[PDB]
Each structure stands twice: as structure tokens, then as C-alpha cells.
Amino acid sequence: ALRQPQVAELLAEARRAFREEFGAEPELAVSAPGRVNLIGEHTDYNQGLVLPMALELMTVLVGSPRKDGLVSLLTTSEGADEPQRLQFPLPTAQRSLEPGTPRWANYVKGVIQYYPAAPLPGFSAVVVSSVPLGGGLSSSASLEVATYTFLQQLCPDSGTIAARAQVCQQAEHSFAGMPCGIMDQFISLMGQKGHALLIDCRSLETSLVPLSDPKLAVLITNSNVRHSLASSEYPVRRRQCEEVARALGAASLREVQLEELEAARDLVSKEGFRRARHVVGEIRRTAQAAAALRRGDYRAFGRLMVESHRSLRDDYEVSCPELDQLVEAALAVPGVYGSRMTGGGFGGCTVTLLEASAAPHAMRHIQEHYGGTATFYLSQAADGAKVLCL
Numbered sequence: 001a002l003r004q005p006q007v008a009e010l011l012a013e014a015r016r017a018f019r020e021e022f023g024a025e026p027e028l029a030v031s032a033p034g035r036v037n038l039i040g041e042h043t044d045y046n047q048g049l050v051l052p053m054a055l056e057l058m059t060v061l062v063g064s065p066r067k068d069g070l071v072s073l074l075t076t077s078e079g080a081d082e083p084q085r086l087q088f089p090l091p092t093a094q095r096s097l098e099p100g101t102p103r104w105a106n107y108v109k110g111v112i113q114y115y116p117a118a119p120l121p122g123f124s125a126v127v128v129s130s131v132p133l134g135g136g137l138s139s140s141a142s143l144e145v146a147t148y149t150f151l152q153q154l155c156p157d158s159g160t161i162a163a164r165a166q167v168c169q170q171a172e173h174s175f176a177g178m179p180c181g182i183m184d185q186f187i188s189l190m191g192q193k194g195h196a197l198l199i200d201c202r203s204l205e206t207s208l209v210p211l212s213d214p215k216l217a218v219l220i221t222n223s224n225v226r227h228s229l230a231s232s233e234y235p236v237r238r239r240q241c242e243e244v245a246r247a248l249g250a251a252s253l254r255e256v257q258l259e260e261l262e263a264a265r266d267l268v269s270k271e272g273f274r275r276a277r278h279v280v281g282e283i284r285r286t287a288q289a290a291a292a293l294r295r296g297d298y299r300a301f302g303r304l305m306v307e308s309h310r311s312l313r314d315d316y317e318v319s320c321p322e323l324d325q326l327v328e329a330a331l332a333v334p335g336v337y338g339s340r341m342t343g344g345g346f347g348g349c350t351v352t353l354l355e356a357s358a359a360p361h362a363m364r365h366i367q368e369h370y371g372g373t374a375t376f377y378l379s380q381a382a383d384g385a386k387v388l389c390l
């Protein structure tokens with residue numbers, strides 16, 4: 001399992017790079033984590049239920065206010081596209097920022113563009129990250145939330161945490177061209193160490209669910225693949241879900257149950273019906289999973305994870321031979337409660353819930369039974385966005 005750097009080490013890397021780059025020590029430091037979704041896939045934009053936890057993998061951003069209305073950025077992240085630096089002036093009423101190259105700067109630009117408070121000053125900042133870029137653990141959401149958290153120090157907003165997630169979400173939409181739901185940004189903002197986070201994506205109610213057992217661990221396996229469908233088929237699923245809700249007279253698939261869906265089978269397409277069945281079933285399973293998690297019922301939680309994956313594979317069709325093979329290998333290992341693809345699909349990571357003692361045995365077997373090269377993360381539930389004054 002990859003070492004996973006602590007905050008103090010990333011902070012120190014960011015600090016040193018900043019000092020060398022701008023000639024002075026930075027004044028502020030913030031962090032925001034990536035995520036793994038335990039269960040509740042492709043429900044968040046359907047106003048469903050999700051149960052993610054924040055990872056120890058995080059994006060760290062150190063910086064200082066400037067007096068010239070200029071923004072100057074540097075990243076050291078492996079995988080970031082060239083150039084590693086970018087400067088631009090703050091947006092104004094007559095001229096707004098715009099997505100372009102380098103791509104990693106669009107996330108930062110986006111948050112700045114839709115930041116709700118004023119006056120925002122210019123600033124200098126160094127970005128570092130332990131979240132694998134585009135690997136399926138929401139590196140971008142961590143970048144957006146870290147950026148938002150940073151801007152709060154420069155110019156405190158005065159709204160809810162949901163308003164913040166939605167700003168970060170808007171950046172992902174408008175500047176990264178990924179019309180994501182609210183989950184990634186919300187868990188990045190609101191995670192707590194030792195807890196998973198049940199999010200009702202209709203009411204925006206959230207609930208901290210304990211998940212801290214020495215005999216229990218969460219194994220994240222990176223397939224290290226990412227089919228182009230991960231980007232292009234995502235928005236298609238949102239339209240297909242919308243089109244099914246429209247035909248049933250429902251505001252969203254949250255208002256629809258399997259039986260109501262059964263009765264209206266001749267009212268939607270075969271493919272649409274399969275899409276809606278996953279969602280409806282997944283929303284149910286996430287409520288069951290949350291309950292199972294509370295009373296410490298790990299075996300039931302695991303089984304519910306396996307149903308989630310089968311549903312994602314057969315009805316919503318957002319899996320791939322890589323993820324499937326990773327899941328099958330995982331379920332063959334003694335001590336494994338459950339396994340499923342996590343995140344958007346078509347590559348990325350799987351999440352596996354197992355007895356802590358089985359993690360070494362599960363890593364060897366999964367790797368040997370995998371045709372590509374898997375990467376492994378053994379993660380505990382971590383905190384959300386934080387701030388440290390330097």
C-alpha cells in the first residue's frame with residue numbers, strides 16, 4: 001500500500017516550494033481531502049442518498065494575499081499538465097476568467113470566478129496533492145474545496161457549507177466541463193475523522209456515521225485505467241435519468257419506487273428502465289447500508305456493496321472489465337465483506353471492506369488476479385477541509 005503522506009509533510013513541501021518561488025514564507029495554509037464512496041453510486045444527482053468518507057489523501061495549498069489584484073500559482077503535483085505555473089488577474093464585472101491551459105488551473109479559476117464574497121484580493125499560492133490525479137478519488141474536488149477554503153481566509157463568505165459545495169460544483173461544471181453531483185465537494189468540506197457521511201442529496205441533511213474499528217479496514221484499489229467514457233457517458237446518464245423522471249411525472253428518481261417503476265415500464269425505454277432501476281435500488285441499499293453500519297453489521301454492509309456493483313454493472317452499465325475483475329478477485333479473499341467500483345465508473349478505483357488482518361492477503365491476490373497494474377490505498381476515515389495559520 002502506497003505510503004500516504006501526512007498533512008505536516010505536504011505542508012512542509014508546499015512551504016519550501018513557496019519560499020523558493022516567491023521569496024517569502026507563506027502566510028496561510030489549507031487542506032482538503034479526496035474521497036471514497038462506500039455506497040450510493042450515481043444517486044447524488046438523482047437527489048438520492050450517498051455514504052462517502054474523506055480520505056487521508058489530500059490537496060494542500062499554501063499562500064498569501066497580494067496587493068495588485070493578481071493571482072500567481074505553482075503546482076508540484078505529479079500528473080499536472082504543463083506549465084506548472086500560471087498567472088492571471090482577478091476577474092472583474094467586465095471580464096471573467098475562462099477555462100484553458102493548463103487544465104489544472106481551471107479548477108482554481110472556477111472557484112475564484114464563482115466565489116460569492118467581495119472584495120477578493122489577488123494572491124500567490126503553491127498547490128500540492130497526494131490524491132492521484134484523475135484516479136477516481138476526487139482530486140479535483142479536493143483542489144476546488146482547498147481553493148474555496150483558501151479564499152475564505154482572504155475574504156470570509158457568510159453562507160452555509162452547501163452553498164460552498166455548490167460553488168465548487170459550479171466550477172467543475174463550467175470550468176472543467178464535468179456536470180458532477182454534489183457529493184465529492186460536500187464530503188471534502190464536511191468529512192470527520194472516524195466517520196462516514198450520510199448525505200441526503202434532496203434535503204441536504206447530513207449525518208455523521210461512526211466507522212472506526214481496529215478489526216475493520218477500507219481497501220482502495222486503483223485500476224489505473226480511465227476509459228474516455230468516464231467523461232463522455234457521465235452526462236448521458238444524467239439525461240437518461242432526467243428523461244425517466246420526466247415520463248413518470250416525478251421531480252426526481254428519489255420520488256419513484258421500484259413498484260411504481262414496474263407499473264410504468266411501457267412508459268420508458270428498455271435502457272431507461274434499467275437506468276432507473278439501479279438508482280431506485282441504490283437509494284434503498286444506501287439507507288440499508290447506513291443502518292447496517294450503525295449497528296456494526298459489516299457482513300450485511302458488504303453484501304449490500306456487492307449488490308451495488310452488480311447493479312452498476314448490469315443496469316446502469318458504468319463498470320468495465322478492469323473494475324469487474326478487481327471486484328471478483330476481491331470477493332475471493334477470506335475476510336473480505338464486500339467490494340464494488342466506486343466513483344463515476346469506466347475505470348478508477350474499487351472500494352473493499354475487509355477485516356484488517358486480511359488486507360495483506362487481499363492485496364497480493366487482487367494484484368495477481370489483475371491483468372493490469374493495481375495501486376493500493378489502506379485508508380481510515382479522515383477530516384474535511386482545514387485551515388492553519390502560518
Ligand SMILES: O=C1CCCC2=C1C1(CCCCC1)N=C(Nc1nc3ccccc3o1)N2
Pocket residue numbers: 059075077079080081103104127128129133134135138139140141142143
Ligand atoms: O484531465 C483530467 C480529467 C479527469 C479528472 C482529472 C483531470 C485532471 C486535469 C489535470 C491533470 C490530470 C487530471 N486532474 C483533475 N484533478 C486534479 N486535482 C488536483 C490537485 C492538485 C493539483 C492538480 C490537480 O488536478 N481531475
Ligand SMILES: CS(=O)(=O)c1nccn1Cc1cscn1
Pocket residue numbers: 099100103104106107174175176177178
Ligand atoms: C481537465 S479539465 O476538464 O479541467 C479541461 N482540460 C482542458 C479543458 N478542460 C475543461 C474543459 C473541458 S470541457 C469544457 N471545459
Ligand SMILES: OC[C@H]1O[C@@H](O)[C@H](O)[C@@H](O)[C@H]1O
Pocket residue numbers: 037040041042043044045180181182183184343344345
Ligand atoms: O456516484 C457517482 C459520482 O460520480 C462522481 O464521479 C461524481 O463526481 C459524483 O458527483 C457522483 O455523481
